[PDB]
Design a protein around this ligand. Structure first.
Ligand code: JOV
Length: 460
């Protein structure tokens, strides 16, 4: 039975509005309704992994697992295994997988982060799951961020707290937050970003939605504008939105947006918005293709419509050679030449690098680099040809070319990371000096750049 090189992943996000679901929700798992939908000819084909994020979920874990498992069984005739389930208040993530994947899945982690302080600590935050699928690390984050058209900054703050404090993936990757720990990271939820147009334009917005004319609305979507200004979700992707706003509907129909201020809304307008979103971030040069991104039309128990997204995702096998794992393979080496970090920091400490990768027995500390002044005020840390030669566990190019090196630049004074990034070993050539590059982030904010050249030796 051959190990897969590709899997399909279903991501669902639904704010249930504290109401039980209707008896049939199969349209969600089938990617049917509005937007980029799945072909009818695929309806009996199960996804490998289903990740279900809910918000304002009134159900017990047991109640929701029974609905989900019985829904997928009806669609696919397959009885899914429960990988993980985690609930913070009314925020829930469920991971289900086809039975053939049970013994490919290991290192399951779950966590939550509560956002806000005092007043604003009460019901918003995130849940997450991570695990290994053969040689591939997968992370999933379901977040319910701060509500309200006038709180986009609060939402960006919630995002930064979630990505700093959510403890998923390999704890040995200690300088790295969840935005560097996974081959593929999926971040979805009721992110609560609004269409930022005047209240007086509500009926105009509804008109535009009825004509399926979204361009002038999406140009005012707070998540798209905040992302474009690098305020939030830096280095994340999102598929083009081609479905109507998923909030705020009158319940029991989809014919009406309920946007007017009411006691129940704290006298706030809820102009039609794309609250409910799916984004991802994969390591460089790993296959990831969005095959669907849309909303259901036929599930009307909530004031939100469910959103679906499906992905093809590249995965690798567990790899065993004569040598590694358990030793190095002297026919392999990674050399970094003429490397320098450019940092936005105004500080003056020395810096060194750490290299982390599952292709190494353990992480490698470099010598301190040489600080120079950049021509436009910047700190440039020069490593030259001084960086340690990295000794991979396996030299076979079918393994090594699929790997990644995580880089942290750390202060000699504090040992705190000032920047994190990732270099793919999927090179155009081996035994050849080739340019490499990664932006560097810390707490998911741009702090600089790492660039230079790499020379990769494999057994071929
Ligand atoms: C018992 C739970 C629900 C805990 O998260 N699931 C597992 O432990 C598990 C482990 C390996 C593979 C798979 Cl499919 C599930």
């Amino acid at each position: 039975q051959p190990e897969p090189d590709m899997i399909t992943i279903f991501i669902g996000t639904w704010n249930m509005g504290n109401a039980p679901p209707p008896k049939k929700i199969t349209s969600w798992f089938l990617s049917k309704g509005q937007g980029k939908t799945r072909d009818d000819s695929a309806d009996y084909i199960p996804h490998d992994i289903y990740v279900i994020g809910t918000q304002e979920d009134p159900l017990s874990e047991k109640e929701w697992l029974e609905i989900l498992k019985h829904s997928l069984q009806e669609i696919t005739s397959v009885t899914f295994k429960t990988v993980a389930i985690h609930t913070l208040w009314n925020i829930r993530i469920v991971v289900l997988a086809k039975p053939e994947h049970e013994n490919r899945i290991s290192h399951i982690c779950t966590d939550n982060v509560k956002t806000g302080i005092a007043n604003t600590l009460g019901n918003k935050g995130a849940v997450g799951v991570s695990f290994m699928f053969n040689g591939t690390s997968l992370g999933f984050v379901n977040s319910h961020l701060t509500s309200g058209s006038e709180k986009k900054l609060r939402r960006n703050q919630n995002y930064m707290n979630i990505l700093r404090f959510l403890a998923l993936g390999d704890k040995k990757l200690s300088p790295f937050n969840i935005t560097h720990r996974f081959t593929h990271l999926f971040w979805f939820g009721d992110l609560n970003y609004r269409v930022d147009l005047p209240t007086w334009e509500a009926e105009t917005i509804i008109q535009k939605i009825k004509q399926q004319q979204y361009a002038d609305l999406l140009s005012h979507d707070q998540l798209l504008t905040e992302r474009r200004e690098q305020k939030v979700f830096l280095h994340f992707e999102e598929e083009e939105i081609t479905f109507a706003p998923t909030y705020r509907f009158e319940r029991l129909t989809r014919d009406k947006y309920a946007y007017t201020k009411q006691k129940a809304t704290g006298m706030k307008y809820n102009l039609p918005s794309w609250c409910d979103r799916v984004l991802w971030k994969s390591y460089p040069l790993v296959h990831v293709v969005c095959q669907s991104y849309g909303s259901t039309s036929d599930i009307m128990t909530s004031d939100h419509s469910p959103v679906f997204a499906t992905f093809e995702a590249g995965v690798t096998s567990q790899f065993v050679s004569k040598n590694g794992p358990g030793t190095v393979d002297s026919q392999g080496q990674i050399e970094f030449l003429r490397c320098y970090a450019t940092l936005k920091t105004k500080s003056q400490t020395k810096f060194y690098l750490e290299f982390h990768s599952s292709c190494l027995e353990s992480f490698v500390k470099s010598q301190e680099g040489e600080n120079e002044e950049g021509s436009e005020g910047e700190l440039v840390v020069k490593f030259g040809e001084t960086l340690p030669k990295l000794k991979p566990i396996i030299s076979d190019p079918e393994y090594l070319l699929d790997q990644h090196i995580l880089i942290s630049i750390k202060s000699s004074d504090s040992d705190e990371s000032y920047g994190e990034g990732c270099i793919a070993l999927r090179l155009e050539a081996t035994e050849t000096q080739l340019p490499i590059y990664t932006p560097l982030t810390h707490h998911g904010e741009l702090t600089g750049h790492f660039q230079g050249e790499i020379k990769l030796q494999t057994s071929q």
